[PDB]
């Protein structure tokens, strides 16, 4: 039902998850996530996996984050026995229902029944100063949808919100 063309034009965060966890028929499970700033080598965030059912994440960042040029994302995941072809993530970010950027990453070849490592390069959009001020000023109103497709079918959907106020 849901293909990449259904999400590629969205101008708002979705009101609900567009797929159920049962539709993840390929048993894809993300187990590690690490963010590196390509201009300082600084690790900006790193986690390792031990209602929303774990499909929502809250992120606490700093104001400097909104001026980064390029960020390297290291992602580790396991895969079931079904071979996976045309694995694709489409991740859209919004502040106050205004599209900031949409990232389209095609995964490399996925080895079934095994752990895989992939690297995504995030080229940040140049954000206007007024938009920078408002995202710092109103935490958690920057939101994202991450859509995962295998052979042009929605199989995973995650959500997140973001703070750029530090802690
Ligand atoms: C799976 C990854 C995430 C849930 C968050 C990582 C997203 C980014 C690093 C993009 C930041 C967007 C801007 C407009 C600055």
Swiss-Prot record:
Residues where tetradecanoate binds: 59
Tissues in which the protein is found: Abundantly expressed in retina, in photoreceptor synapses and inner segments. Expressed in a much lesser extent in several other tissues.
**PTM entry text:** Phosphorylation suppresses its interaction with KLHL18 and down-regulates its KLHL18-mediated degradation. Phosphorylated more under light conditions than dark conditions. Dephosphorylated by calcineurin.
GO molecular function, one example? lipid binding
Q: Which UniProt keywords apply?
A: Cone-rod dystrophy, Cytoplasm, Cytoskeleton, Disease variant, Endocytosis, Lipid-binding, Phosphoprotein, Protein transport, Sensory transduction, Transport, Vision
Which stretches of sequence are listed as region Required for centrosome localization? Answer: 51-167
Cellular compartments per GO CC = centrosome; cytosol; intercellular bridge; spindle midzone; spindle pole; synapse
Show which residues constitute the signal peptide.
none
Where, per UniProt, does this protein localize?
Answer: Cytoplasm, Cytoskeleton, Microtubule organizing center, Centrosome; Cytoplasm, Cytoskeleton, Spindle pole; Cytoplasm, Cytoskeleton, Spindle
Q: Name one GO biological process term.
A: chemical synaptic transmission
> Any domain commentary?
Adopts an immunoglobulin-like beta-sandwich fold forming a hydrophobic cavity that captures N-terminally myristoylated target peptides. Phe residues within the hydrophobic beta sandwich are required for myristate binding.
Q: Write out the function statement from the record.
A: Involved in synaptic functions in photoreceptor cells, the signal transduction in immune cells as a Src family kinase activator, endosome recycling, the uptake of bacteria and endocytosis, protein trafficking in sensory neurons and as lipid-binding chaperone with specificity for a diverse subset of myristoylated proteins. Specifically binds the myristoyl moiety of a subset of N-terminally myristoylated proteins and is required for their localization. Binds myristoylated GNAT1 and is required for G-protein localization and trafficking in sensory neurons.
Q: Which disease is reported for it?
A: Immunodeficiency 13: A rare and heterogeneous syndrome defined by a reproducible reduction in the CD4 T-lymphocyte count (less than 300 cells per microliter or less than 20% of total T-cells) in the absence of HIV infection or other known causes of immunodeficiency. IMD13 predisposes to infections and malignancy. Cone-rod dystrophy 24: An autosomal dominant form of cone-rod dystrophy, an inherited retinal dystrophy characterized by retinal pigment deposits visible on fundus examination, predominantly in the macular region, and initial loss of cone photoreceptors followed by rod degeneration. This leads to decreased visual acuity and sensitivity in the central visual field, followed by loss of peripheral vision. Severe loss of vision occurs earlier than in retinitis pigmentosa, due to cone photoreceptors degenerating at a higher rate than rod photoreceptors.
Q: How does it assemble?
A: Interacts with CABP4; in the absence of calcium. Interacts with DNM1; leading to a decrease of DNM1 GTPase activity. May interact with GTP-bound ARL1. Interacts with ARL2 and ARL3 (GTP-bound forms); this promotes the release of myyristoylated cargo proteins. Found in a complex with ARL3, RP2 and UNC119; RP2 induces hydrolysis of GTP ARL3 in the complex, leading to the release of UNC119. Interacts with NPHP3 (when myristoylated). Interacts with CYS1 (when myristoylated). Interacts with MACIR; interaction only takes place when UNC119 is not liganded with myristoylated proteins.
Q: Which family does it belong to?
A: Belongs to the PDE6D/unc-119 family.
Q: What is the name listed in the Swiss-Prot or TrEMBL entry for this protein?
A: Protein unc-119 homolog A
Per the UniProt entry, what species is this protein from, by scientific name?
Homo sapiens
Q: Which residues of the full protein are shown?
A: 59 to 239 of 240
